[PDB]
Write a protein that binds this ligand. Structure first.
Ligand SMILES: NC(=O)C1=CN([C@@H]2O[C@H](COP(=O)(O)OP(=O)(O)OC[C@H]3O[C@@H](n4cnc5c(N)ncnc54)[C@H](OP(=O)(O)O)[C@@H]3O)[C@@H](O)[C@H]2O)C=CC1
Ligand SMILES: NC(=O)C1=CN([C@@H]2O[C@H](COP(=O)(O)OP(=O)(O)OC[C@H]3O[C@@H](n4cnc5c(N)ncnc54)[C@H](OP(=O)(O)O)[C@@H]3O)[C@@H](O)[C@H]2O)C=CC1
Lengths: 527, 521
């Protein structure tokens, strides 16, 4: 007898893939959990049923009606959190607090869109801006609208957020009336599949609105057509491979990418060791290094501090990192669990060795015995902190990402903005999801933030006045844009209402006033 | 021995390409006009100077300051229109009225962005939407902003609009603080090069802000990097080649495509021959087939009419098309000039022959003697009107584009149950995504409803009715305050739409901070 083979949901039916499948395992205990397989699926019908029946069914509803369905899904997921936490513990090896980012982060994001969606109203098209006169006598005018794309939304998701990656994307997709096919990363696919199964079993959404495929991705892009959209999250390397596909190069399907990002944290010149902003910086660096063992795309990887502050920074980080206990998330004493897999454990350790060739290791608690875990079975890596004294000439600092509990600190020469050098150094990341900045002076934060804006999708400013209210460097608030230029993928997600454009076509309607009036009665946009 | 070799403007200097270059010719008279060449240019330097020197200089200026420079260009271009019209006549073979679409359309568009830009004020970044609270006590908030991309804008432009294609794109790009490298299509590059030369000569913009390269495209995409943007206008085939390039696939540069589009015109059930809307439809179809000899990306290619209206439609189109005189644009009696080149003449004739395999030729004035032009020299194609009786089983109708004075009429089945035009909407959709559909009715309210039905497959829906006979801006004319582009076959691109055009040239970022810091940007 073998572990459960998880079924796919395609063309409105639960269908097992054929063969022995791929086993998912517990990254702490090594226990075999479940299996996945996409072998032998009818991908043509999987895509046609979603596109035709799923799409027609969703578009038949208004925005408000679809939002009401999202609100029902929220209630359902909320009721089954107990099941989800147990899966997260086993499949991902994350502490309860860290699992919560995925599970409760996911639910929060979905609820936010349910609430926002109600404000889109009882219509089948959205109003983009206002009418513009095209005539001296105002007889002829233009009004832009958004209409749902007559395609499917294919989500190729990363291993780190099986729950949040699904709902962050599915909420604006379904709100926009676009049917979803999700393809979660294999290693941690279990939570994704269970959530989809719960939602599908509940019959909240019409048949074809939500489908799931786990296992091999072979054949998926071959089914993508010109009105479909694809949202990919993962490595820059994989993203480039996807971009070459005929689905995009020949058929022009939309593709959003979130990829590698060496996110920066900048300690401002005024934030000296004696000031409150200093402590906030130390706290934020440690949090981002350790939450999910640093396995967030937005985690701080590069921390830039004034030359004068380098030694006190390292000392403070060492002291705080020392309190981070590592091991089995089932133990209450554990502050940080495992990476997602032994494979990731290997990648991360190789990355640490690579960085070490060009950087000094200031902190490494590898020798500390794991709590309730066997170091030889678990995918636990202890926090590692590097120092790069010459970031201008550094060969790896600005280029090599270690997707684990690892970051590098580098001094900058204080100067124009005092932080001008740090801004240039951040820019060397070649485009990032987020930069955070730390100062005692709220009047200083704006100018610095604008200097970072063209190279960072989000700039997150932490200061004493917001010690209790700031929402976290790495946490993605759904009302704010997520994504970044250059290496980070050039993508955009979330940002509240901004998320809808990806799922719509914008059209200019030019017509007599009375025609603009009648088309306008059939649209809505929030005040 | 020898026509003028036009110089490129790269890295702030005028540099001739090497070799004999490529000759541009008058498509009516066959006269050699000028030559272009990009041979031996230092492309690395051209792109670095634009990105670094040009980009830094533009970004140092505020939106309003850049808008003010745009306004100066407008005045300059206006003062030199006489030069531009003579070039358009010779190089493009277009009538004065058709040349005006390119020249005065270009100027209008630039001036529109100059005005829009003045309103943006003395700032270096734009607010996107309003500030939003991220905490119960409102101490922590978020404001989205737009910042200019630290790259260059490369425009690979189509032959049809050397002026408008330039200013179309260059206006929002320069307003956004992004340096421009224009690469106009060879055959008609002269007007583009002259406009760029006049602007450069005048020193309105900083060195590096505006560059031009004419001749071979070899090596251009190789210079494109991750913060650059590229705007291509032309064939789907070429677009597909561009999309495959490492500049986009590996380095992730932005690419906007506007490509082949089988734009529809739909005659509504109510628009019978005895109604004023019927003549508006006839007039618009004829205008779109003949303006620039049908060489607009937006021209009507497929005209869908109720089964009952088909014969009156064909007869009315025949009568109107008969009035369209063809020949030398220098002659004031000529209503329609030449295609842009003898090569295009052959391409269009091939296209006509292809369509004829599956369609009946209802009108063809090929044998009507040209005015002041030699049929063996000139690239004059006469209007051709096809009829496809069964558009449901038609292959070529919905797929094959002829970039000339050529369209196809087809009947639709009116729906008598509960829109009358349902079948026509389905037929328009068969074009697989288009720039524009026009719709024609006596009933303004009905048009609003029908428009919404066409919106997901057309970038623009343009409704013509008696109430706007005098004010409607034309099926094919691209008003800069409205979005230009379309889904699917049309390329999935978006241009213009007033301030909407700026997004392409900026990065949007969420700033989350203490509310005080948010308030003052
Ligand atoms: N040196 C390294 O290896 C480094 C890795 N990373 C991290 O690797 C993580 C991704 O895990 P993954 O295998 O390892 O990497 P990729 O980014 O593929 O992972 C993203 C998703 O794409 C899917 N995918 C992968 N290849 C293809 C393909 N050819 N066609 C269609 N879909 C595909 C994967 O599915 P499935 O998982 O089922 O294979 C995965 O779920 C990323 O989150 C990234 O941050 C970060 C830094 C360095
Ligand atoms: N069956 C037919 O007759 C068809 C005709 N067409 C017509 O084709 C017209 C456009 O073609 P036409 O101008 O001759 O020229 P083509 O599209 O070949 O080329 C147009 C522009 O794109 C450039 N280009 C081509 N390949 C690349 C590349 N790999 N990298 C960078 N730039 C490149 C060309 O540069 P360069 O100077 O180096 O060539 C030129 O500047 C369309 O407007 C349409 O009317 C479209 C489809 C079918």
């Amino acid at each position: 007898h073998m572990t459960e083979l998880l079924k796919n949901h395609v063309a409105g039916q639960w269908i097992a893939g054929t063969g022995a499948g791929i086993t998912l395992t517990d990254p702490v205990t090594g226990v075999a959990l479940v299996r996945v397989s996409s072998e032998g699926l009818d991908l043509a019908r999987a895509f046609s049923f979603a596109r035709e029946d799923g799409g027609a069914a969703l578009r038949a509803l208004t925005y408000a009606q679809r939002a009401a369905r999202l609100a029902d899904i929220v209630k359902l997921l909320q009721a089954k959190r107990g099941d989800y936490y147990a899966i997260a513990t086993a499949n991902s090896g994350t502490t309860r607090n860290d699992s919560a980012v995925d599970i409760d982060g996911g639910i929060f994001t979905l609820s936010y869109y349910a609430k926002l969606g109600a404000s889109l109203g009882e219509v089948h098209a959205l109003r983009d801006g206002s009418a513009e006169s095209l005539s001296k006598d105002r007889s002829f005018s233009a009004q832009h609208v958004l209409s749902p794309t007559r395609g499917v939304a294919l989500f190729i998701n990363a291993f780190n957020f099986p729950s949040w990656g699904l709902w962050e994307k599915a909420a604006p997709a379904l709100l926009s009336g676009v049917p979803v096919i999700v393809k979660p990363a294999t290693a941690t696919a279990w939570l994704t599949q269970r959530m989809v199964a719960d939602v599908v079993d509940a019959g909240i959404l019409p048949p074809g609105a939500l489908s799931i495929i786990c296992g091999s991705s072979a054949g998926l892009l071959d089914q993508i057509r010109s009105f479909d959209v694809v949202s990919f999250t993962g490595s820059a390397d994989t993203a480039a491979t996807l971009r070459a596909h005929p689905a995009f190069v020949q058929r022009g399907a939309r593709l959003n990418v979130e990829a590698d990002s060496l996110n920066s944290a900048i300690l401002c010149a005024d934030a000296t060791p004696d000031t409150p902003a200093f402590d906030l910086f130390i706290k934020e660096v440690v949090r981002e290094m350790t939450v999910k063992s640093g396995q967030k795309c937005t985690a701080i990887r590069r921390a830039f501090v004034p030359e004068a502050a380098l030694e006190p920074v390292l000392e403070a980080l060492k002291a705080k990192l020392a309190k981070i206990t590592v091991g089995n998330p089932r133990n209450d004493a554990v502050r940080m669990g495992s990476l997602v897999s032994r494979e990731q454990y290997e990648n991360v350790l190789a990355g640490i060795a690579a960085l070490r060739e060009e950087a000094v290791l200031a902190y490494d608690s590898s020798a500390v015995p794991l709590i309730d875990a066997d170091a030889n079975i678990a995918a636990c890596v202890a926090p590692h902190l590097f120092v790069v004294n010459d970031p201008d000439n550094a060969t790896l600092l600005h280029d090599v990402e270690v997707f684990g509990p690892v970051a590098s600190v580098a001094p900058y020469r204080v100067t124009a903005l005092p932080e001008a050098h740090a801004v240039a150094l951040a820019r060397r990341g070649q485009g990032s999801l987020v930069a955070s900045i730390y100062s005692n002076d709220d009047a200083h934060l704006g100018r610095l933030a604008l200097e970072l804006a063209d190279s960072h999708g989000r700039v997150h400013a932490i200061s004493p006045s917001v010690q209790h209210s700031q929402t976290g460097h790495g946490n993605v608030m759904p009302m704010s844009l997520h994504g970044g230029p250059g290496r980070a993928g050039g993508g955009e997600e979330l940002g509240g209402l901004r998320a809808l454009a990806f799922y719509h076509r914008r059209s200019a309607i030019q017509a007599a006033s009375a025609a603009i009036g009648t088309l306008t009665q059939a649209t809505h946009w929030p005040a």
